[PDB]
Amino acid sequence: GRVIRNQRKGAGSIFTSHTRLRKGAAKLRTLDYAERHGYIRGVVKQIIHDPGRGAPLAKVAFRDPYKYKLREETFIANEGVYTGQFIYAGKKASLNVGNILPLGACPEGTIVSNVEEKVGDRGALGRTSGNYVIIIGHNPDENKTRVKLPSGAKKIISSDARGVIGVVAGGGRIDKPLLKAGRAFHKYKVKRNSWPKTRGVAMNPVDHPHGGGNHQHIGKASTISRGAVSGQKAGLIAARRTGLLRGTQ
RNA sequence: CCAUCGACCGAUCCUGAUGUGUUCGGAUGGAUUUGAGUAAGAGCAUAGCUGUUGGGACCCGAAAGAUGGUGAACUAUGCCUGAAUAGGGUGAAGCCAGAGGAAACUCUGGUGGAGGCUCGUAGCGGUUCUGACGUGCAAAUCGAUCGUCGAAUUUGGGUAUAGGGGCGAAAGACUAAUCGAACCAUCUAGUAGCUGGUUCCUGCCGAAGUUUCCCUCAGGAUAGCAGAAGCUCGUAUCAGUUUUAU
RNA sequence: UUGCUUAAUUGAACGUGGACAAUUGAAUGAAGAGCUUUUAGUGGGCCAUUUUUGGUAAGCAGAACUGGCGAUGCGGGAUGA
RNA sequence: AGUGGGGAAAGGUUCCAUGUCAACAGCAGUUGGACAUGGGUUAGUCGAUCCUAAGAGAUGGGGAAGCUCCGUUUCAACGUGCUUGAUUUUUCAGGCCAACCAUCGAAAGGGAAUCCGGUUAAAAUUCCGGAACUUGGAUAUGGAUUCUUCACGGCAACGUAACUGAAUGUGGAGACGUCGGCGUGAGCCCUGGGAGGAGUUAUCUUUUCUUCUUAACAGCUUAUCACCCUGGAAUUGGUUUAUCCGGAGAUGGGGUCUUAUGGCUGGAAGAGCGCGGUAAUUUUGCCGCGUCCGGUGCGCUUACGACGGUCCUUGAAAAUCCACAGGAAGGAAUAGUUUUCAUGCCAAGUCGUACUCAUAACCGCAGCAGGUCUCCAAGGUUAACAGCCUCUAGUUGAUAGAAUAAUGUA
């Protein structure tokens, strides 16, 4: 047969992300002396739309502690953050929406976003619109914090990892139907080349494991082993179960 | 030279003398066994015809396979930067005014100018005539008719993706008139039990389509049938026939 | 002659020596008999008489013997392997 | 929405003049994109050149037997650094920084600066005449400023001929989708008077057609929006085609600003245009007159403006230029400073530039009914940039003659 559409994406010729209009990478500040020992104050200059992103971004200006210079940061805007607001980041920052605090400095039940998986990676968890991270508890002896991720998973993170207080702005986006193929076209025009999708069952046997037949049908189980190889992993990969989800999981 | 019975040498089997590193030796006598042997050498070398095998292999002929390269001037898709798209119809929100109601609210007239809306040009496409043409104007065009015509629109240029690879709103489609695996050169005079051809004269002889074996059944080998060279001899004793006896 | 065989001096096989001469033991014929090497093409067949199997039959399919066509012209069957 | 006038790609001399007809132009040929000989493309301002885009790609490194692959500042000791006071001791003294930063990548993106009239057989935003502009450099005079050293005025918005300002920093411009109606301008269309020229005139027609124009650049003036001062608003008012605004200060009164756009003047009538009268084999003219004053709009095209709608779509970058913050350093009185005020001086290299752009200059074997990106766009009819007729411009090219059976094609 032929190389299937799954495998052509790794080469990344026409499958790279369309990034001309993007407004910068959304990251926290580099963890420095001020954030480790006290707090540093910045001011929100802009709240802007980032193409390909549901969450708006905030442009926050900080002073450089060591040279006469202004540093502009690109944060993910939490809902309620406004232009001209003062943003405080550090160990001694107060528990206000938009402030960046270490996870150990936040009491249980604190809603936090753009949380660091590892100390200083500048934000990994809960970055999309309407999403957040809940702080479950602390383990001060081991310097660890328990959090709940938007997927429902419980994670143990260093208490020195940082997060931004509040919920990511732009939530409720999925509640409205797109209603049109053109709307999805414009949605993916600034994301990547993944739309529209032809069904593999509608192809020929060269194109896909599902192609061929005198009727459109998969022919074999569409649940594929985790240990299958590239060109085989088309369908439900390592599916623990199938069918309509009934009851609680 | 022919037929036949013997003899000798080697192997195999049997017997087993004087003797002895007591386990070796193997005299002697045998055997419906066996060798491409001995039995007063015939070979070696050169050349010629014919036949054989490997080689391009009598000549021309695949569909394929491999190695290394060249193409995105067509086209497919993404990206970057530009450009293009008469005139109408319909009349969404929002807004103004009036009327009715206890309230919750309702009705009417305007205004407004929404929509992968609609009629319809340019444009883009290509339904039907199964029209023309069909050694064409044209290796896809011409005419009428038709789809769509403000967006998933059309399009220039730049740029990216390269052959078991790309790209595909998916037809095995498109990837320079080439695609169910492009093009170029080479391996390569690839192999072919298959098709075609195979060049002067006369003289003499002259077939087979049958046996057996074969993944054998359009092919081979084998035996037969045929030619050539002769050799040993010269009526020796043979015959697709009869008779007699059985 | 033998180591085979017989109760044997019997036999078996192969012999020495002697006799039977062209009517040397039927016909007819005999461009002579015997022997060897090597190699070609072929290995689709078909037809006629007679015998014969399957089939309703077939210019059908399958065997037997012979003769033909193939490979072959010539006279006849008008024409025709 | 051309058979008009230009261009991009592509071609490459096809351009122009002269000669010329063997071949080619599927008839012809005296003609030609054919053949032969010559001629022809003029730039500081138009492009390239420079910038960065998607991307391409050296170096330091790391793979790979290797051809080479990855990577693009990457695990790198990465400046052929600058700015000054200089020194004439051709030595220096230092003062700042070195995040990022090889390079290539657009004749449609960004971007310093030019227009009009004339001129050739063929070139022209390139030549000639005149009139400007930008950048780089040099540099003097005038003006400006200083004894209160680095100017004044205005309540203010802000004004001006000028009117210090290093390192470093902050901003702005470059720099940005699309649609809808509205408003203003420009060009075109329409039209009145007057001064000319042409046409019709049996009859009619104070008639029909036509000329009456004004570049870049310089000065003054000119605007929606926005802003300032005054004042204090319900009986709410102002206000758009579109309902938004006002105690976070409306209406009213008075001002400030951007100069898009228009007006006046200079450029500039001397030019061009339209007439009339004369010169002459005649290179080429010479003379006179006029070139003026209006109006109109759901008009067309286009530019701009203030608005409004739209998106799970929010619609490049960089070079480059400026301003501001900062206060380093240097500054006067018998004299000091500055080329962001005026005037004056010098220079601007290299390459492209002819012509076609298509029913004959490109690609389809060809002078092929195919294909190939874009700009300008008159009158009538009309909803209309449709169809139909016409003006300017351009073509009249496609073998032809004679007949008019059948069968065709339309």
Add this chain to the structure above:
RNA sequence: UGAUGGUCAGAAAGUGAUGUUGACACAAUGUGAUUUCUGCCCAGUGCUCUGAAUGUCAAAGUGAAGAAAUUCAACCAAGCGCGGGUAAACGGCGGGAGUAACUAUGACUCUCUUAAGGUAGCCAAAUGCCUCGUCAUCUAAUUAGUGACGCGCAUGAAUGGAUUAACGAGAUUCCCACUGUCCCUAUCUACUAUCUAGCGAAACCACAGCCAAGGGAACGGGCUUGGCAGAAUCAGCGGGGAAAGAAGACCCUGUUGAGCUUGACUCUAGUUUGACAUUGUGAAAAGUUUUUACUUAUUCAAUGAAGCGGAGCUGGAGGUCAAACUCCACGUUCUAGCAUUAAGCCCUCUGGGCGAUCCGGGUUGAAGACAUUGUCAGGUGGGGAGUUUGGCUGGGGCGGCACAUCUGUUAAACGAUAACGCAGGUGUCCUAAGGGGGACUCAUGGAGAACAGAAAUCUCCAGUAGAACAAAAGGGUAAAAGUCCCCUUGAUUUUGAUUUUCAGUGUGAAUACAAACCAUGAAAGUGUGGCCUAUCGAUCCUUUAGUCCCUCGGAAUUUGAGGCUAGAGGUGCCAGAAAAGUUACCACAGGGAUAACUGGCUUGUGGCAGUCAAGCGUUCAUAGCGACAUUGCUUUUUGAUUCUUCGAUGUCGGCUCUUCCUAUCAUACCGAAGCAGAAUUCGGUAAGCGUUGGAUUGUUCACCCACUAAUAGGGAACGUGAGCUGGGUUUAGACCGUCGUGAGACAGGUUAGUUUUACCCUACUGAUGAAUGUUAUCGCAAUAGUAAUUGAACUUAGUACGAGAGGAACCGUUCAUUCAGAUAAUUGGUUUUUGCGG
């Protein structure tokens, strides 16, 4: 899938895409707006989940034996197995009988059985074979359409079920309007064609070009026999040249491919699991293993390597029970401002210290001897690679085995002899069912004997085998070859010869001896498996036995290995490859050795016609029929065959047009009747002449409606595609149902799908034309062609005939149908009269 990640890329990499990303995300799939719903099944195949105990279980490692190679054993990862989950995973979703005060049905019951047995819905639907289902409606008539019905070959629920407004160059039916689509054609215009001047190709071409019949490769231009036959030609035309275009694309063959699939054969990138290495330093506990401590190897990340680690200054605290130890902090939080090139103090040294605490120069985190990487080892791996996927055959395929074989027959009295001929058999079975010896006689019948009878056991007689001998059939056998008894292993050893098949090769099987050693019998003798004819297997490799022999090549010993001779392990496609599919996307070499048309032979079958005459026909065989039988014809059916064509003869039907046949439907003339008339039936000469308009269907066929004198049947390459058309079939797109794991299949349904060339020769239709002294006019007529057809009305006549009911015909008259040949008065149509008007 929470980043030490998922998905994907790369030969590798200090390498990449998603990713300027972070579950409202990225990646992978299925279904396909809305509405209403998405039932039951986890047995199968997948996927997934745990492993406390656990079958299998690689390399390394461990233990034992051995002189060692080596062997054996224990242990033993993942995987598999075991257990669970999962269908909006792949998928699946049953049969048989009885039953209700008529019948029908079966609410109900019984019975087999599954993982579950098709739920809600829907339907002769694009899915139903039968089938043109049945009913209704639509029409004059409907294989079409629509509405119902439903034991539905084979409907059915995100392999989505049922609906559905709007939309559609999608498929279909009906109605109005409209019309040359048609009845049924006519006329007009331009451009061709045509003729001329100029210019000027190509396809194609063995030679060529008139027919009929024959034979012939079974459809001739040539050959044979006939008809005939007279220069040179022009415009048309499409009968023929099995016309041209292309080494058939269907079919088969080839030890030719390729695309695709899978549980084919053989591998493989990747991935996973173990071991060793990288790999070091400690502690503890289990018997080397487990755990956790260190950091410097290694790995991850960030930064313009900016503030790390420890200690000390300052406050806030503990209640201080010595003496200040322990803990915390140690300059910034109403506001969209500002923060940059140190002030100040101290020592003098255009400079140093403090401001700005000291010390360690570890940039800072994470991770850590685990990852990672290298090398082996096991698993997984149609993602990919390579290859394979018998033969015969009345085409192939399916079936069968006629593939190694045995008996009888075919088989034609030696031997041999074929077919997918006929009736059958073999892949075994037997320590006796082998060998020897001895004794006996079998099947069956009759006559007798308690229970006892047709069949128990006993007795006699008869008994040529009518029994038995392992198994097919044939042969053979009587003091035996059969039955019973006794003893045995000759079913042994060595190696030759011979017979059959035959090449006089192998294999199988068998025969007669030689040399041994035995069994049995008194002995002669017999015995080298089965009474005879079938009952079976090479090279290479392995294994065993024998000889204990030969060799391991520098010389030895002992292991091990290799030789020699004989068996065994097996090839059944049986003289003996190691082997799954699909192609409707297809390719190549060929084949008329071979299928799908026509043609040819045949004529079973189809159709048609005779002979006989038992019966039918009130009686009566034969007016008209005619059983049981029997003889033919035809080639308008379908078979059978495979002769022609596979370097191609265009394969359905219709339209159009001509001709022919007769087995005559009508029309002319007649004979017969169970012929009164009328009608009808049977028959003769007869093909002169006609044989229709429509609904449904692609249809041939069919079936209705209707008219008619009648609505006969056929042929001409199943006439006729360079005549058309293209509805069907039968390329490639797509849907459904059933089948298949799948790619895919269906001779099932459905929808969309390029129809090319004549200008040559001939033939046909027309048109000229040399020369028969020239020219003109008028003629003759050989030969060829030929043409008319049918009905109605009136009259005869309400007559003949007839009980009546009914009810003709000839002569004649007027019209009409179909056809033919003209013509343009009239009427209509046509208009470039561009004539006139608008």
Add this chain to the structure above:
RNA sequence: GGCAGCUCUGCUACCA
């Protein structure tokens, strides 16, 4: 043909 459990199921192995 090896293991192992309940006459036998499961796993593993395959040069005539």
